[PDB]
Tab-separated table of C-alpha atoms and ligand atoms in Angstrom:
chain	number	residue	atom	x	y	z
P	1	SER	CA	247.941	-123.148	85.149
P	2	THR	CA	245.169	-121.275	87.050
P	3	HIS	CA	241.839	-123.586	87.645
P	4	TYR	CA	239.633	-121.224	89.549
P	5	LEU	CA	239.739	-117.582	90.825
P	6	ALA	CA	237.466	-116.626	93.899
P	7	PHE	CA	236.733	-113.065	94.812
P	8	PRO	CA	236.249	-111.890	98.297
P	9	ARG	CA	232.481	-111.655	98.087
P	10	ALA	CA	232.568	-115.525	98.213
P	11	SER	CA	234.848	-115.409	101.210
P	12	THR	CA	233.738	-115.399	104.886
P	13	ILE	CA	235.163	-112.174	106.293
P	14	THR	CA	234.670	-111.218	109.949
P	15	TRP	CA	233.184	-107.619	110.085
P	16	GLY	CA	233.059	-107.649	106.296
P	17	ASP	CA	229.573	-106.094	106.235
P	18	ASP	CA	230.532	-103.470	108.637
P	19	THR	CA	231.312	-100.199	106.917
P	20	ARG	CA	233.343	-98.935	110.005
P	21	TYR	CA	235.807	-101.822	109.512
P	22	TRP	CA	235.640	-102.915	105.809
P	23	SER	CA	234.800	-101.274	102.291
P	24	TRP	CA	233.594	-102.724	98.939
P	25	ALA	CA	234.698	-101.214	95.659
P	26	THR	CA	233.481	-102.611	92.298
P	27	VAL	CA	236.238	-102.512	89.646
P	28	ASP	CA	236.916	-104.340	86.184
P	29	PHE	CA	238.959	-107.385	86.086
P	30	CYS	CA	239.617	-108.851	82.452
P	31	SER	CA	235.924	-107.770	81.490
P	32	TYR	CA	234.434	-109.184	84.798
P	33	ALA	CA	232.836	-106.976	87.501
P	34	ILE	CA	234.471	-107.730	90.772
P	35	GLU	CA	234.263	-106.255	94.303
P	36	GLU	CA	237.643	-105.677	96.233
P	37	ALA	CA	237.396	-106.095	99.903
P	38	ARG	CA	239.276	-103.140	101.408
P	39	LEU	CA	240.209	-103.309	105.211
P	40	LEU	CA	240.093	-99.922	106.927
P	41	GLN	CA	240.830	-101.279	110.359
P	42	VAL	CA	240.166	-104.386	112.638
P	43	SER	CA	241.724	-106.269	115.601
P	44	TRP	CA	240.092	-109.508	114.410
P	45	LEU	CA	241.342	-110.074	110.734
P	46	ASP	CA	239.767	-113.357	109.456
P	47	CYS	CA	239.237	-114.322	105.773
P	48	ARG	CA	238.359	-117.659	104.814
P	49	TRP	CA	237.024	-118.968	101.426
P	50	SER	CA	235.344	-122.383	101.264
P	51	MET	CA	235.368	-124.624	98.361
P	52	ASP	CA	234.783	-128.562	98.212
P	53	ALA	CA	237.439	-131.292	97.427
P	54	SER	CA	234.989	-132.443	94.668
P	55	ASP	CA	235.695	-129.147	92.857
P	56	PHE	CA	239.305	-130.448	92.040
P	57	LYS	CA	240.878	-133.490	90.543
P	58	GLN	CA	242.402	-136.253	92.751
P	59	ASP	CA	246.085	-137.139	92.965
P	60	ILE	CA	247.143	-133.588	91.590
P	61	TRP	CA	249.279	-131.109	93.435
P	62	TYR	CA	247.380	-127.796	93.742
P	63	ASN	CA	248.897	-124.404	95.174
P	64	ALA	CA	246.842	-121.575	96.517
P	65	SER	CA	247.647	-117.895	96.280
P	66	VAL	CA	245.800	-114.697	97.638
P	67	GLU	CA	246.518	-111.418	95.642
P	68	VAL	CA	246.593	-108.315	98.098
P	69	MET	CA	247.750	-104.534	98.231
P	70	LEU	CA	248.837	-102.637	101.150
P	71	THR	CA	247.210	-99.021	101.030
P	72	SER	CA	248.822	-95.722	101.879
P	73	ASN	CA	247.211	-95.928	105.451
P	74	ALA	CA	248.729	-99.617	105.905
P	75	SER	CA	249.513	-100.283	109.582
P	76	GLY	CA	249.951	-103.062	112.265
P	77	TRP	CA	251.480	-105.723	109.789
P	78	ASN	CA	254.436	-106.322	112.037
P	79	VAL	CA	252.614	-109.161	113.412
P	80	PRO	CA	252.436	-112.510	111.765
P	81	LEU	CA	249.707	-113.219	109.304
P	82	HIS	CA	248.542	-116.837	109.606
P	83	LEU	CA	248.003	-118.607	106.288
P	84	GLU	CA	246.017	-121.808	106.219
P	85	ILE	CA	244.556	-124.594	103.993
P	86	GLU	CA	242.216	-126.898	106.014
P	87	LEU	CA	241.341	-130.208	104.285
P	88	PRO	CA	238.057	-132.220	104.770
P	89	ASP	CA	239.614	-134.404	107.479
P	90	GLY	CA	240.671	-131.319	109.671
P	91	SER	CA	244.237	-131.622	108.869
P	92	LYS	CA	245.905	-128.258	107.964
P	93	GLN	CA	248.699	-126.623	105.906
P	94	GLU	CA	249.914	-123.676	108.126
P	95	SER	CA	252.101	-120.712	107.432
P	96	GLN	CA	253.210	-117.371	108.510
P	97	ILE	CA	254.156	-114.200	106.730
P	98	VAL	CA	255.097	-110.575	107.838
P	99	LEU	CA	253.784	-107.767	105.660
P	100	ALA	CA	255.373	-104.772	107.439
P	101	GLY	CA	258.457	-104.823	105.101
P	102	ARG	CA	256.320	-104.741	101.761
P	103	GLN	CA	255.874	-101.619	99.624
P	104	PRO	CA	252.327	-100.087	99.517
P	105	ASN	CA	249.957	-99.502	96.426
P	106	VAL	CA	251.303	-102.508	94.457
P	107	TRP	CA	249.445	-105.895	94.035
P	108	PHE	CA	251.524	-108.826	95.327
P	109	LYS	CA	250.485	-112.602	95.755
P	110	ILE	CA	250.831	-114.472	98.941
P	111	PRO	CA	251.269	-118.331	98.708
P	112	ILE	CA	249.115	-120.055	101.381
P	113	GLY	CA	250.329	-123.624	100.699
P	114	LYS	CA	250.005	-126.798	98.544
P	115	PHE	CA	247.557	-129.782	98.636
P	116	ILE	CA	246.646	-133.071	97.051
P	117	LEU	CA	243.368	-135.169	97.429
P	118	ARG	CA	243.933	-138.939	97.961
P	119	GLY	CA	241.401	-141.729	99.070
P	120	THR	CA	237.754	-137.120	97.273
P	121	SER	CA	235.171	-134.619	98.701
P	122	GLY	CA	234.294	-132.200	101.751
P	123	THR	CA	235.186	-128.574	102.637
P	124	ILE	CA	238.598	-127.127	101.863
P	125	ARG	CA	239.257	-123.787	103.785
P	126	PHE	CA	241.599	-121.080	102.338
P	127	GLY	CA	242.167	-118.157	104.882
P	128	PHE	CA	244.462	-115.856	106.591
P	129	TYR	CA	243.972	-114.276	109.998
P	130	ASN	CA	245.429	-112.426	112.792
P	131	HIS	CA	243.417	-112.248	116.245
P	132	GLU	CA	245.941	-110.270	118.244
P	133	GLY	CA	244.725	-107.085	120.226
P	134	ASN	CA	246.491	-104.690	117.724
P	135	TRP	CA	244.999	-102.802	114.834
P	136	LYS	CA	245.595	-104.062	111.314
P	137	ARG	CA	244.670	-101.518	108.807
P	138	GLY	CA	244.783	-100.991	104.895
P	139	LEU	CA	244.784	-104.247	103.239
P	140	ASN	CA	242.856	-104.547	99.919
P	141	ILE	CA	241.991	-108.209	98.668
P	142	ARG	CA	241.606	-109.032	94.898
P	143	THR	CA	241.298	-112.615	94.732
P	144	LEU	CA	242.160	-116.182	95.712
P	145	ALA	CA	244.006	-118.166	92.958
P	146	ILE	CA	244.120	-121.973	92.702
P	147	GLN	CA	246.865	-123.520	90.249
P	148	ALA	CA	248.232	-127.010	89.151
A	1	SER	CA	229.302	-109.021	90.975
A	2	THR	CA	231.485	-111.960	89.915
A	3	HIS	CA	232.287	-114.592	92.758
A	4	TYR	CA	234.222	-117.288	91.038
A	5	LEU	CA	235.955	-117.914	87.523
A	6	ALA	CA	236.498	-121.518	86.405
A	7	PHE	CA	238.856	-122.198	83.653
A	8	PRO	CA	238.350	-125.092	81.341
A	9	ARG	CA	241.179	-127.368	82.975
A	10	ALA	CA	238.714	-127.730	85.935
A	11	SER	CA	235.963	-128.981	83.529
A	12	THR	CA	235.297	-132.417	82.446
A	13	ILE	CA	235.475	-132.118	78.579
A	14	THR	CA	234.851	-135.327	76.442
A	15	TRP	CA	237.887	-135.913	74.196
A	16	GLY	CA	239.628	-132.909	75.852
A	17	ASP	CA	242.938	-135.054	76.310
A	18	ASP	CA	242.713	-136.097	72.585
A	19	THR	CA	244.969	-133.899	70.602
A	20	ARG	CA	243.042	-134.803	67.317
A	21	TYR	CA	239.823	-133.225	68.644
A	22	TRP	CA	240.975	-130.429	71.221
A	23	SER	CA	243.877	-128.121	71.797
A	24	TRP	CA	245.203	-126.221	74.905
A	25	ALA	CA	246.961	-122.917	74.600
A	26	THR	CA	248.410	-121.050	77.637
A	27	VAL	CA	247.587	-117.314	77.641
A	28	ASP	CA	247.668	-114.392	80.183
A	29	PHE	CA	244.372	-113.567	81.974
A	30	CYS	CA	244.818	-110.322	84.082
A	31	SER	CA	248.132	-111.733	85.399
A	32	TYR	CA	246.978	-115.354	85.833
A	33	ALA	CA	248.418	-118.020	83.602
A	34	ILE	CA	245.290	-119.907	81.999
A	35	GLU	CA	244.738	-122.691	79.385
A	36	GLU	CA	242.084	-121.991	76.749
A	37	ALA	CA	240.361	-125.287	75.556
A	38	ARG	CA	240.231	-124.890	71.587
A	39	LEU	CA	237.849	-127.460	69.857
A	40	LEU	CA	239.255	-128.449	66.432
A	41	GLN	CA	236.269	-130.945	65.713
A	42	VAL	CA	234.037	-133.599	67.527
A	43	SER	CA	230.639	-135.126	67.133
A	44	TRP	CA	230.355	-135.331	70.781
A	45	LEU	CA	230.525	-131.894	72.374
A	46	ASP	CA	230.366	-132.181	76.073
A	47	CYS	CA	231.761	-129.675	78.697
A	48	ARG	CA	230.653	-129.750	82.191
A	49	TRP	CA	232.166	-127.892	85.245
A	50	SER	CA	231.481	-129.377	88.872
A	51	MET	CA	231.211	-127.223	91.940
A	52	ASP	CA	229.415	-127.719	95.323
A	53	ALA	CA	226.429	-126.004	96.702
A	54	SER	CA	228.554	-125.365	99.845
A	55	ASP	CA	230.961	-123.044	97.607
A	56	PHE	CA	227.834	-120.542	97.577
A	57	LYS	CA	225.681	-118.533	99.899
A	58	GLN	CA	221.969	-119.610	100.408
A	59	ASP	CA	218.876	-117.793	99.459
A	60	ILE	CA	220.756	-115.614	96.947
A	61	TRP	CA	220.095	-115.791	93.094
A	62	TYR	CA	223.295	-116.751	91.024
A	63	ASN	CA	223.577	-116.404	87.337
A	64	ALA	CA	226.341	-118.546	85.172
A	65	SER	CA	227.818	-117.615	82.197
A	66	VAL	CA	230.519	-119.172	79.808
A	67	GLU	CA	232.851	-117.035	77.667
A	68	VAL	CA	233.493	-118.496	74.148
A	69	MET	CA	235.105	-117.532	70.629
A	70	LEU	CA	234.189	-119.141	67.214
A	71	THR	CA	237.361	-119.520	65.078
A	72	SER	CA	237.859	-118.818	61.422
A	73	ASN	CA	237.274	-122.443	60.732
A	74	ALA	CA	234.046	-122.539	62.940
A	75	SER	CA	231.479	-124.981	61.538
A	76	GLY	CA	228.286	-127.249	62.717
A	77	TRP	CA	226.762	-124.607	64.945
A	78	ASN	CA	223.453	-124.675	63.260
A	79	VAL	CA	222.362	-127.417	65.577
A	80	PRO	CA	221.172	-126.300	69.233
A	81	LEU	CA	223.776	-126.167	71.947
A	82	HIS	CA	222.167	-127.379	75.091
A	83	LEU	CA	222.938	-125.364	78.128
A	84	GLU	CA	222.359	-126.750	81.764
A	85	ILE	CA	222.812	-126.142	85.395
A	86	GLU	CA	222.060	-129.505	87.434
A	87	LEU	CA	221.477	-128.815	91.322
A	88	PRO	CA	222.398	-131.568	93.939
A	89	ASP	CA	218.666	-132.997	93.941
A	90	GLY	CA	218.969	-133.757	90.106
A	91	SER	CA	216.611	-130.781	89.009
A	92	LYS	CA	218.054	-128.878	86.027
A	93	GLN	CA	217.897	-125.538	84.581
A	94	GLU	CA	217.918	-126.194	80.739
A	95	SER	CA	218.360	-123.953	77.735
A	96	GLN	CA	219.404	-123.759	74.036
A	97	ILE	CA	221.362	-121.418	71.811
A	98	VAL	CA	222.302	-121.365	68.127
A	99	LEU	CA	225.774	-120.161	67.464
A	100	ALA	CA	225.674	-120.388	63.623
A	101	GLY	CA	224.606	-116.562	63.349
A	102	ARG	CA	227.589	-115.239	65.449
A	103	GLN	CA	230.694	-113.388	64.094
A	104	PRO	CA	233.979	-115.356	64.739
A	105	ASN	CA	237.175	-114.296	66.370
A	106	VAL	CA	235.315	-112.232	69.124
A	107	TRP	CA	234.718	-113.355	72.730
A	108	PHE	CA	231.042	-113.397	73.772
A	109	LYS	CA	229.408	-114.601	76.930
A	110	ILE	CA	226.541	-117.363	76.863
A	111	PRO	CA	224.318	-117.342	79.835
A	112	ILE	CA	223.396	-121.000	81.135
A	113	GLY	CA	220.725	-119.916	83.613
A	114	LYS	CA	220.102	-118.932	87.346
A	115	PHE	CA	219.724	-120.931	90.525
A	116	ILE	CA	219.193	-120.265	94.327
A	117	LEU	CA	220.030	-122.716	97.229
A	118	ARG	CA	217.158	-123.224	99.849
A	119	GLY	CA	216.778	-125.822	102.544
A	120	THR	CA	222.832	-126.279	101.111
A	121	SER	CA	225.490	-128.501	99.697
A	122	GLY	CA	226.012	-131.210	97.020
A	123	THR	CA	227.365	-131.115	93.324
A	124	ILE	CA	226.210	-128.399	91.035
A	125	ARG	CA	227.015	-129.122	87.284
A	126	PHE	CA	227.576	-126.217	84.523
A	127	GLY	CA	227.548	-127.479	81.176
A	128	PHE	CA	226.973	-127.318	77.468
A	129	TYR	CA	226.666	-130.244	75.009
A	130	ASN	CA	225.618	-131.392	71.610
A	131	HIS	CA	225.595	-135.042	70.855
A	132	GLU	CA	224.307	-135.114	67.265
A	133	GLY	CA	226.153	-136.956	64.424
A	134	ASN	CA	227.376	-133.731	62.970
A	135	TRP	CA	230.857	-132.075	63.286
A	136	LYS	CA	231.178	-129.222	65.646
A	137	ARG	CA	234.618	-127.315	64.848
A	138	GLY	CA	236.346	-124.233	66.093
A	139	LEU	CA	234.980	-123.233	69.482
A	140	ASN	CA	237.576	-121.702	72.004
A	141	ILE	CA	236.513	-121.708	75.881
A	142	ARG	CA	238.038	-118.949	78.092
A	143	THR	CA	236.160	-119.421	81.561
A	144	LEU	CA	232.957	-120.053	83.339
A	145	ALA	CA	231.847	-117.072	85.349
A	146	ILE	CA	229.318	-117.198	88.398
A	147	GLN	CA	227.632	-113.812	89.565
A	148	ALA	CA	225.199	-112.607	92.130
B	1	LIG	PT1	241.477	-114.930	102.599
B	2	LIG	PT1	231.151	-125.963	79.578
């Protein structure tokens, strides 16, 4: 079961307001108007949603997922995409995925890890990033999904 | 633009775990598995989502909306449905709507008010309720939508 969807406008995306690096396109999602974040090109890819432990139930396993598409111009996905959940104590769930082997122009969902809240509140960060000196191009971001 | 969708499983719904008063049905929403909350009957209708000011951007006008359906067995909607946003300082946005005049078996969206965050964090409550000694029956709840 899906408890929340968070759209990229709610994310902190480095360069997201820079038109030479990122685009925004309005589109319909099951009657709701959302904006997809479309990466043209960056060296510094960093996309981080912020929600609060208090937004969730305690002692329940949550999984997080981000739905993306590679464009026809997709490139530089040979480097590891770092996946992260940061809990309010600073502890993290850390992962890695290589996108170079994926087919373009189809939505797929990347899992970014599982968490549980024991002992209640504080920021919880949901992100992916790659900071290497190579160009990442042509990733479109639909939504963060949080399940339990 | 829609920043978040919150599904009723994330809400605090009085009697929601009581099978004599409420039902849960799994259904598809633009590829995501959600559970609709279906009210059979209560006298005490109370449905309240909790998110944190920190989940939003400051100095930006947000509107909140809840998508519902009246069933074929819909009843007791002649009383005012109280709509509420409670900010972290305790201040509220308060509204009222009468559902008795609405057609059943079609999704519609109820606006529950607008807010802006000036001076940052704390619980923000999104709810509707009616506590009168009358039976409310046959309301299905899809999702809270938060826009800016
Ligand atoms: Pt992200
Ligand atoms: Pt509600």
